[PDB]
Amino acid sequence: WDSRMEASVVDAVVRGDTGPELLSRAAALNWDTTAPATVLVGTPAPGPNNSDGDSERASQDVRDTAARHGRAALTDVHGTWLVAIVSGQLSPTEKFLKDLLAAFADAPVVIGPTAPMLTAAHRSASEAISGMNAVAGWRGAPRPVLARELLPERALMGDASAIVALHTDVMRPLADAGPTLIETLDAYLDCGGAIEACARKLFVHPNTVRYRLKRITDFTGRDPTQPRDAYVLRVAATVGQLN
Ligand code: NA
């Protein structure tokens, strides 16, 4: 196992140095170069004492866990974080990922988008790293959390790609809803989710307001009645107006 070479492959994805030769470097480490690539970042699990080799233990676990599930992983460190690239399609509820999480501390883990192949994974890396930089700003984040689920936090920290993603992935689909839905959303967010009250203000049954929020969820995938969703819609609508 050549772990200088493993780190150089990870670091070349992190830096966006993704020429063809990256693939042979990876094949050489038993990466299937056709597979999807997902970057995640977290802290290594704290070991029984020893404590600089936490990172080396956690790397080994990660690679073992991958092998056991039929996948490959490459790792590198990013100061006190461990950066892992893992192969294959990746579901939130699936067992590979539950096991993988045991290699990390009981502290945030941020999962980047899945890329089609290793050489396409620079954005996955940049977003997972940006999310990890941003995750302190949502203390209640779930473990794990998607980079794309931290757009307010990344936006407030100055990550341009988060601002763009609020437009492209929240505002643009919102905008498909037309003025009756956006107006209802805006009112509901200002009443703080107080349905009876808002309904009176919008001259409609409570159940019409509820139905219209369920439509907001149809256009955008965010549920205005869930406090996280509602916060993301509200920040996204702001950013929408100021660009
Ligand atoms: Na993957």
Author numbering: 165 to 213, 216 to 409
Authors' own words:
MabR (Rv2242), a PucR-type transcription factor, plays a crucial role in regulating mycolic acid biosynthesis in Mycobacterium tuberculosis. Regulation of the fas-II operon is mediated by Rv2242, the gene product located immediately upstream of the operon promoter. The MabR structure integrates three distinct structural modules: a non-heme globin, a GGDEF-like domain, and an HTH motif. In summary, only MabR-type proteins are characterized by the unique combination of a globin fold, GGDEF-like domain, and HTH motif, and this specific protein architecture is largely restricted to Actinomycetia bacteria, with few exceptions.
The structure was refined to a resolution of 2.03 Å, with final R-factor and R-free of 0.197 and 0.254, respectively. The crystallographic asymmetric unit contains a single protein molecule. A disulfide bridge is found between Cys357 and Cys364. Overall, C-MabR is composed of two structural domains: a presumed regulatory or sensor α/β domain, and an all-α effector domain containing the HTH DNA-binding motif. These two domains are connected by two helices, α12 and α13. The GGDEF-like domain of MabR adopts the canonical fold of a diguanylate cyclase GGDEF domain, which comprises five anti-parallel β-strands (β1-β5) surrounded by five α-helices. However, MabR's GGDEF-like domain is unlikely to possess diguanylate cyclase activity, as the corresponding regions display entirely different amino acid sequences: HGTWL for the A site and RHGR for the I site. The buried surface area of this interface is 1128 Å2, which constitutes only ∼10 % of the total protein surface area of each monomer– a relatively low percentage compared to other observed dimers. C-MabR displayed a clear binding profile, forming a 1:2 DNA-to-protein complex with an apparent Kd of 4.3 μM, consistent with the TSA findings.
